[PDB]
Design a protein around this ligand. Structure first.
Ligand code: NA
Length: 53
């Protein structure tokens, strides 16, 4: 993803570690991503979070 896309995903993750289905769809539209891309990103980000804390 672009630098900006990643930063915006990180901004949301800091606030909410899990999103609802509707929230992922809204964020996908806002960040120019597919719903599945947002879902996968957050799964992988949670794995990083678990590893690092
Ligand atoms: Na999620």
């Amino acid at each position: 993803f672009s630098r900006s896309q990643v930063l915006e995903l990180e901004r949301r993750f800091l606030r909410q570690k899990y999103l609802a289905s509707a929230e992922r769809a809204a964020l996908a539209k806002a960040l120019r991503m597919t719903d599945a891309q947002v879902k996968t990103w957050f799964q992988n980000r949670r794995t990083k979070w678990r590893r690092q804390t």
